[model samples]
Target: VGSLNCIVAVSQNMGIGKNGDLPWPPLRNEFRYFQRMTTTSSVEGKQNLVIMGKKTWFSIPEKNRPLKGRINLVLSRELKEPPQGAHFLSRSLDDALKLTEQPELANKVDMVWIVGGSSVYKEAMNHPGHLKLFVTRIMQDFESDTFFPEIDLEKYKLLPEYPGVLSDVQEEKGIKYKFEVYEKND
Candidate 1:
């Protein structure tokens, strides 16, 4: 099975989004961190896969529709065709992983990044192949309608410092935050 990883920015109260948008203003540096990790791959001819729910897909600006440099897999049970610029449509997370295992792409898939809305994140946290949780812990509270699921420390043990991960607390526009990665314990 391909490695499944999740990336999220959550507030002090676990808020992640508000009305399909980010509750807080853009954090440029944090965005770059996300860009770097999701696009980096060890295998020269391979690419990383980013799986996101349909709503989350739309939440991305139109200009970044395909999220360039990575395969975009949109999960939707209602859409008959993949969204514009999307490379694949998956009815479930299971199907999404299967895409990477197809003979044509078995070795072409590296890391599988899960960018989410709520339900998708919840499912991914318990996914069979889940490996790491790359999270940005925002040290502030925001009014958010969507919140990330509470992480079970027993399952996802936080690493003091992860390779290639900028683990220091950061401040942007007066907002305090930090990047973290949690490895699966079992």
Candidate 2:
């Protein structure tokens, strides 16, 4: 529906969690998880962006939240004003996409990384053609009040990576993640 393809993710689907942290470790790896999407050579461009829910914005340190180089779009009704660096917005997934599609950003092809807060992800999962998801698994069980969507496994495909640490979580370096990409079957 929107000119840009929205890539979606949530902190919890089955249960709530924050920033990929669980019972043992509360962390920032969620940021790392989001950044990996950019590693795909095919995804680079000024229009490519990272979008998140209001709570997710507060979850991030002011410095890292509205990350640099890529568009950072936020979804929050409370955030009447976008942060100086961010394209702060108050829109549902549909409205955000429509904004992108109608007056496409500088780059002809646009993409958004739907970074967490659950409700945002739930809204996005409704649109199949618009999203591709990258999910990471936490090694420990977590105590969370928030989470991602209950995505249908049948609709997604997995992308494998040789194990590595999540930069956002570690002070030293040692947490494992299986980077998986989910796209619509059709």
Model 2: per-residue lDDT, tens digit, 2-109? 222334332323444544433235346555555666433244444456667777666667777566656667887766788666764856776676666554553443
- Against the true structure, what is each candidate's TM-score? 0.94, 0.70
Q: Which 10 consecutive residues of model 1 have the lowest summed lDDT?
A: 122-131
Best lDDT among the predictions, by candidate number: 1
Query: What does candidate 1 score on TM?
Result: 0.94
lDDT of 2: 0.56
Worst window of 10 by summed lDDT in candidate 2: 1-10
Error of 2 at 184 (Å): 1.2
Checking candidate 2 for backbone clashes, the offending pairs are 3-101, 12-147, 12-148, 13-148, 16-146, 23-141, 23-142
Best TM-score among the predictions, by candidate number: 1
lDDT of each: 0.87, 0.56
Give the residue spans of candidate 2 off by over 4 A.
1-33, 39-47, 104-109, 159-176
In the range 109-179, model 1's lDDT, one tens digit per residue, is 88789988788888887776447888899999999999999988878788999888877789999999999
**RMSD for each of the candidates:** 1.4, 5.1
